Symmetry: D2
Subunit: 319 residues, 4 copies
């Protein structure tokens, strides 16, 4: 039997005996992602170019996520990469979930048709205080659900929750995601490393050494191949699906790293851990950082455990 | 006024006073590419997964190109990356054009949702001999038309002919490509370099030196950023659209390079030259190589002229 | 706030405090209908016509409904117009719902591109006996849910449940139904009558008289217009949405009428009553017939109450 | 070999040795019709209903036809049901063709999801005068091409030209029409008659008699079935494809009939004659009427020759 995402979410919801609030939240997200995907793939562009005489994607994207999420009646605080402040949802529309998201990531690559994606993280609100931005400032270890949709050759939604990681391909003919990979586990050790080497001159010494190992294995094994798409979601997904390592460590231009903690790193740290991989800054597990700002950045190295561990040891060694 | 690809091909055809054979050829290709794109984006996958109880993409892809091209009644010799021998078309279906193509490229990246593409090159048959594979063995300088379709965030067809390079976005809602960039010119000098550094230990000395320049500019300018998707069509298109350099030089694993001369390098060499860029092996212009085998490989460095020229000078210097 | 069908079903489910079984059932149906719609509108037909070298719609249709419904884990007995016997679902896949449906209706009109549709009725299984066909033999008054999807200019799903009738337009771009008409009420009296007059010579005398009234109003009011598409779902939907009357009374060729009781008449009788209209055979309310065979037929007159009542009075008068 | 509409138009163009102007015209139309079809089937409606916070179909429809047709550079005078005056195209955009069209017909049926369609007729401009509305006032016998697209269960384009009638199904997955019926011939005699009987009290005496024959065959043959969708394009297409007769004769409300001569009747008269059928007002062949106003109406009876002839004889008899 074929399993759609809507059924998958619904059975899981039933299993956990939820009141169905989170299920509605997940149904919404899932709707939002289909709307973004159709917009990404440029359906209807001929209208912009005057086919009948007569918004930018990342703005449209953000607006779909915000409106559809408010529509779920399941959230109370949203954080979007696109908005300077946490969005507090209106009382009449308020539920218990806090959702951090990046509506459209890798848009420095929309002119180039580069694979892009949406990243989401979902927290339960615990405090009884009138909902506020501090509700977003929870370490990633407290995620209830997290994943991303990727708009690449095809569109996939990957959703990690307490019980594993699942990939659902979008069948754009019928507007339905199809379970295709169940209980996904990253391989222990990979063959690909993924970093922007253009920063070779700002790299710290453990990264420099690690890059040399990959190219000239001190033990005379096969050198890793290199891949760097420049879309976190594209690169992380290849990592998840094929193994290897993905790095965005701190550099002089970005001394606390470049990627964002709340709505890029953490979600991906979460998918990686439930898939058996690791996600570190080099000094600490990503998921254990207690954030202090909703747009805080962090360095991140993630992927196959043996690989991330080999780099951690090099950071350790450079005491 | 909006301009579709079908109208663009047709006006150009009219302008050149063609008998309309090449126009039919280009209309077919354009159809084929839409069929591949819908298959790439996985429409109808739910059927494979048993939505109603009850082929691989690159095989499907190849079959669409062959059948649609035969359908144009405009070709006599096809070369596909997927077929060991040139396909000679049947007399009743025979026209004057020779088409070299790669039906689906970067499929080592379909499990990973990596952007993939189709690359085509079109030659006129000149000899009067019964059509044969030697009809494919023409230096790329003799191309009449060439381009690629990219299946990335969105689908684009790029078509270069004697009079410039044009990009047409696919609007999947109505099955129509829309002219979006006219007369495209690569910038003289870029900021991105694109190579698989995992081969750092097989690289020849001009490549090694060039990579160091990009990372540590001897003149203290800004270091290039690195991008490597691992799909020739994705990487070349970013190059075309944003400038920079793309390299696949020879290595010990691949001593004559890896990419294919007839249906990957040449088409891209052609798009690059009509867009004002360069495409060299390091010793000679790609388009001037007289091929001797339909699956011959060549090293290729291509992109922005100042950039390719800086590398050529380093090859020259290492006399 | 926009309301999708998935959210609508889910909130209603929550409201009724269901265990979510019926919700899964309704989610499935809703999926099935999108798959049928894409097949109806002929996506992918080029493959049948050899675009890459190398089932009938109503068979495909039936198979989608059966497989997707089994997939819901919510049903135990299915009745399809297409299957001679009730389908008993397997124990491991068994739930409490009995679903009578017509997978694709008005296919005598697929060669002609006539609007066609899917009709469904859902009963709860009450008896404790090992599920069997008698579980389908429930008067329509016991329906829990019922409606149809129409594949006409656009695709609409209409769903009637205890609390009213709702119409959801399919947005085929994102595979999502959008609530567009809430709590739909048929108008008391209409201006259109819908019957196949080609049977004028078999018509009983109350129908003959009623047809004359519509054309030559004995009171000198405006004569009704006539519409007869020949697709029950098309004609009933126009009735629902614009008012008037729809008739398929008994004739010599079909002495108990032509339409089917379990999976055409009853569902439509149910939509009509919750929308404020009537559905009679001429002697009794359709919804009160206790069926004795799963493929039993019945005469049906349905639509706006004043209109159906005017015809009932004529049947009464012809004592 | 599969045949797309674009190839079909192009080969025919080649065969007739056209300069390719009409080919561009037909390519445009074909594009326009795909844009209308996607709009009809309501892709993107969720945007109207606020999926991201934040025109009517027949207006949109009209605008697509006008802009795409101007885009062909092939026309000089357009007549649309929607515009009070002929549209004269601008000199820089001017070609030789006159196109009469009805952008979206049967919209009195968009609330009801009734099958609707677009009807077009194409004339060559013969006079040398500065193009004007009299260029539209040509009897239908002078058509060069004519047909309609139908938005019904699926979308079909039917195109009649001097050499026969051809039907092309739209495959919405790839935005391509597929030849499915070649050289279509209506059957000599049919079994269906199609008229709005609600006008029984205004009908002239030959229509009244003809209707009685269909229901009570004076020769004791089988009575015709009745079908009346209320969309000219739906009813005419069923007629073409299944045979029978379609009538919209004059009534007191509409003493010169209701349908329009330039952009409904004539095109359909033309398709019918090239398919072997007839199209009469009852006194004269539709195609031979010399129109005097661009929005002139005419009575029309059309379909299978034996059938139209049986009605003509009854009009003759009622001397
Ligand atoms: N659809 C679902 N899938 C997986 N887990 C869920 C789902 N719904 C609820 N849960 C678990 O049950 C908790 C409470 O559910 P709720 O009543 O929906 O807020 C959630 O925070 C999850 O831990
Ligand atoms: N559609 C077209 N676009 C651009 N150039 C064309 C086109 N059709 C023909 N040409 C030029 O005219 C030559 C002969 O055309 P043909 O008669 O189509 O083989 C082609 O090889 C091209 O050089
Ligand atoms: N999604 C729903 N929409 C409307 N009514 C429902 C829904 N789910 C359940 N109900 C009502 O609750 C009953 C039991 O629900 P269930 O536990 O899903 O079988 C159903 O038979 C309906 O009467
Ligand atoms: N694509 C076509 N299909 C069928 N007939 C055509 C086509 N193109 C041209 N013709 C015939 O050739 C005439 C002149 O063509 P043109 O030069 O396109 O205006 C047209 O009016 C038609 O009679
Ligand atoms: O150009 P850089 O510095 O290598 O940045 C690449 C990163 O930038 C982003 O687009 C911005 O978030 C990421 O998706 C991607 O990983
Ligand atoms: O793994 P490598 O050796 O870097 O190869 C990448 C290249 O391989 C291909 O997929 C094979 O043609 C190209 O599209 C791409 O440029
Ligand atoms: O040709 P008839 O006898 O008027 O039948 C029309 C009816 O037939 C069906 O196609 C068969 O169920 C109905 O949808 C429609 O109402
Ligand atoms: O309601 P009536 O008078 O039967 O009109 C039906 C006709 O009206 C139109 O919608 C108006 O052109 C036609 O397509 C159709 O044949
Ligand atoms: C496209 C445009 C751009 O600037 N890049 C990032 C290097 C792209 O991929
Ligand atoms: C996906 C799968 C694979 O092996 N790679 C190439 C390194 C992918 O991108
Ligand atoms: C199409 C084909 C057919 O026989 N009819 C029913 C009268 C159609 O509508
Ligand atoms: C829909 C709405 C309307 O008034 N009718 C025409 C009788 C429809 O079909
Ligand atoms: Mg981001
Ligand atoms: Mg290749
Ligand atoms: Mg039926
Ligand atoms: Mg009209």
């Amino acid at each position: 039997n074929i399993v759609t995402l809507t059924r998958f979410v619904m059975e899981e919801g039933r299993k956990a005996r939820g009141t169905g609030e989170m299920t509605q939240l997940l149904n919404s997200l899932c709707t939002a992602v289909k709307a973004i995907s159709t917009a990404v793939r440029k359906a209807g562009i001929a209208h912009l170019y005057g086919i009948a005489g007569s918004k930018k994607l990342d703005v449209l994207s953000n607006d779909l996520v915000i409106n559809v999420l408010k529509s779920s009646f399941a959230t109370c605080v949203l954080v979007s990469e696109e908005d300077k402040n946490a969005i507090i949802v209106e009382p009449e529309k308020r539920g218990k979930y806090v959702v951090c998201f990046d509506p459209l990531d890798g848009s420095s690559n929309i002119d180039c048709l580069v694979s892009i994606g949406t990243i989401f993280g979902i927290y339960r609100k615990n405090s009884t205080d009138e909902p506020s931005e501090k509700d977003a400032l929870q370490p990633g270890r407290n995620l209830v659900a997290a994943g991303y949709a990727l708009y690449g050759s095809a569109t996939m939604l990957v959703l990690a929750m307490v019980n594993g990681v699942n990939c659902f391909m979008l069948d754009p003919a019928i507007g339905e995601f199809i379970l295709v990979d169940r209980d996904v586990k990253i391989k222990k050790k990979g063959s690909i490393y993924s970093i922007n080497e253009g920063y070779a001159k700002e790299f710290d010494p453990a990264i420099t050494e690690y890059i040399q190992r990959k190219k000239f294995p001190p033990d005379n094994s096969a050198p890793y191949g290199a891949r760097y798409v420049g879309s976190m979601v594209a690169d992380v997904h290849r990592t998840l699906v094929y193994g290897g390592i993905f790095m965005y460590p701190a550099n002089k231009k970005s001394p606390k790293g470049k990627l964002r903690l709340l709505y890029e790193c953490n979600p991906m740290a979460y998918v990686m851990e439930k898939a058996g991989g690791l996600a570190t800054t080099g000094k600490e597990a990503v998921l254990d950082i207690v954030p202090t700002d909703i747009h805080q950045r962090a360095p991140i190295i993630l992927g196959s455990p043996e690989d991330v561990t080999e780099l951690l040891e090099i950071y350790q060694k450079h005491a």
